[PDB]
Ligand SMILES: Cc1ncc(CO)c(N)n1
Ligand SMILES: Cc1ncc(CO)c(N)n1
């Protein structure tokens with residue numbers, strides 16, 4: 033309840049309907065429980081890796097237009113940090129699961145992936161810096177909160193790769209990317225209302241992305 | 250209309266295009282049986298589209314690899330403010346909707362996605378790849394007209410007929426024709442351009458469906 | 465006197481130092497007087513078409529993120545109304561002087577040209593829409609004011625091409641362009657201070673451009 | 682040896698002027714007046730910010746995941762490497778980040794920053810890299826040439842400034858950027874105009890910093 037401090041708290045609360053569906057999504061619950069079929073995870077990894085590449089490009093775009101040096105530093109940190117944290121982890125997860133980077137490059141993105149990646153890049157290439165951040169926040173934050181909610185099931189999760197995947201989102205370093213991004217938005221000088229459309233769309237794509245990964249769309 | 254790279258693209262997208270061509274929204278629209286509320290809903294959505302479409306052409310224009318290609322991109326763009334957009338401005342007014350209503354209409358999810366796809370592409374990808382993403386949007390509407398044009402003669406609704414007149418017009422067809430020749434002169438293969446032509450085509454299908462369900 | 469009004473008037477008056485140097489530049493005075501050596505004009509035409517081409521692209525970029533349909537409609541007009549006007553005539557100015565569009569494509573831009581074109585494109589790709597307009601205004605406005613100042617010497621100007629060149633910048637269609645550009649900025653709600661850096665740099669480039677054209681750089 | 686070697690050789694006339702520039706020679710020797718260094722730090726810090734933005738743009742358009750990573754590592758390594766140093770240098774010399782934000786860029790700086798951002802937002806990825814290479818590489822080579830004068834350079838800040846360009850980590854950014862270009866699939870000739878313009882700006886930038894513009 034105390035995360036509901038400022039602008040970003042307001043945004044999170046407005047998206048509660050969406051986020052509760054994300055938090056309660058069967059893909060998520062199964063993944064953390066250890067019951068998710070490995071083929072679905074494989075399919076998810078292929079899709080999500082492509083999303084991360086394009087997510088890094090989106091951060092790059094936002095960085096190209098940061099209204100201050102510090103803000104530019106934050107976006108770059110989020111971008112290199114995405115390559116150095118998540119993507120490195122994914123690269124290793126693919127390898128352990130018998131998928132190559134070439135397989136990744138050859139995996140066709142599903143429709144939601146195309147649309148979501150498009151939305152983030154479009155926004156980050158054309159909208160105000162803080163609007164971009166608002167569009168990028170749900171991606172970062174939802175994954176942390178998902179972890180914060182289903183973390184307990186990991187101790188009973190028999191699958192090693194699912195646990196390794198989840199470890200990033202429980203890590204203080206990842207929660208710090210989240211905290212840092214929220215701090216940027218809470219001090220942006222802009223209202224929750226101005227930021228809402230961006231935060232909302234991205235949140236809706238996060239829900240469709242999990243669904244798409246669940247039904248191997 | 251199957252003689253070069255764009256013909257190759259069209260034929261590879263046949264599965265998708267046939268679904269578009271046979272979509273109930275389209276058939277009803279040309280037949281004159283489409284409920285006015287669905288048309289209104291469609292007009293609101295499509296304006297936001299066209300505005301963003303214009304921006305996409307602008308972006309593509311911004312890095313045409315030749316003056317000619319830029320001049321082209323740029324015409325299609327301005328010609329989208331005074332060509333399709335002008336028309337739509339009237340069509341709305343006749344239906345009792347203001348530009349303000351247009352500005353206030355929330356785009357549906359497909360519209361957001363599609364607009365994002367075109368702008369994203371046009372801001373980032375090679376000029377020809379952008380054109381390949383933009384072609385289905387232009388061409389499908391011409392072909393839709395080429396297919397359902399006959400029903401207009403029996404179509405009792407004036408606004409639907411006025412809407413359709415643009416896509417039957419030689420000026421629109423020529424636009425389409427020129428756009429193809431740009432691509433067919435690109436010197437790139439179909440498979441290089443396929444992904445872009447495909448996605449856009451898929452969006453066109455989802456757009457009609459979204460307009461049909463009042464999404 | 466009545467170009468003293470609002471934000472753009474403020475900008476003009478701050479750039480007075482720079483603008484008076486432009487308005488009194490020998491290239492300009494000789495061009496209107498009819499004394500400018502044809503070779504310098506030819507050189508100028510080669511450079512300036514490359515400019516106009518890139519100017520068009522810059523408008524296109526600004527258009528790409530106009531914050532309103534009206535503002536966008538404008539940008540798009542200038543960008544196309546630059547292929548349609550200025551660029552169209554220039555094509556005739558060159559043909560008359562025995563230079564082809566191919567010659568234009570092959571003319572290497574001088575360093576100022578490169579720099580200026582880069583500045584406009586860079587700005588229009590990255591900066592706020594109004595900031596872009598502020599960068600673009602000097603280019604438009606200086607040429608009108610140059611005409612407003614040296615227009616009288618045209619009746620005594622024996623060179624037809626120079627007079628044809630000048631006719632655009634005396635035309636109500638061009639002068640109005642400037643008027644609309646100014647009103648766009650004057651209604652922005654942005655201060656002079658915020659727009660100054662962009663107006664200034666462009667103005668400095670206009671001065672260097674004339675100098676470069678004068679010395680055959 | 683490869684495409685980038687070809688580029689360097691073609692720009693030899695320009696680079697020898699950069700390598701022999703009095704600003705550079707004085708900076709490494711320790712004879713550069715502190716006011717000129719201060720003036721340079723203000724200008725160059727602004728340049729590095731915009732240089733990072735340029736790399737960001739080029740990254741947004743990398744034709745491969747790996748290429749996107751390289752640009753990203755260059756951009757971020759520019760923040761955490763060179764920019765962090767300049768921040769320490771500015772502070773040690775009594776200049777704030779605010780002073781930096783308020784410093785008006787000189788004409789060459791505006792033009793050079795514009796060139797890089799223009800290119801990186803609109804040209805092919807490898808053309809961008811060709812535009813960015815001279816910036817990175819010239820500084821390494823300058824260091825490679827004037828490094829010896831440092832041992833006896835009495836000025837600490839000049840030495841600290843130079844330390845980055847002698848460092849294996851900075852040379853690695855350079856080597857990695859060359860390798861990207863050497864295997865780009867493109868000719869020296871296609872890349873030349875970009876490498877050249879940047880090189881010419883590097884020379885004007887030093888001159889501008891020397892004359893206090
Ligand atoms: C679709 C998606 N959203 C968010 C994340 C976490 O940044 C991810 N890896 N993938
Ligand atoms: C969605 C859509 N596609 C194409 C056109 C015609 O360019 C249009 N008006 N709307």
Ligand SMILES: Cc1ncc(CO)c(N)n1
Pocket residue numbers: 512515516550602603604607670673
């Ligand atoms: C350099 C220059 N500036 C302005 C104009 C007028 O837009 C022009 N034609 N050339």
Ligand SMILES: Cc1ncc(CO)c(N)n1
Pocket residue numbers: 725728729763816817820883886
């Ligand atoms: C002007 C300039 N060129 C190159 C470097 C090295 O990246 C720098 N810091 N500044």
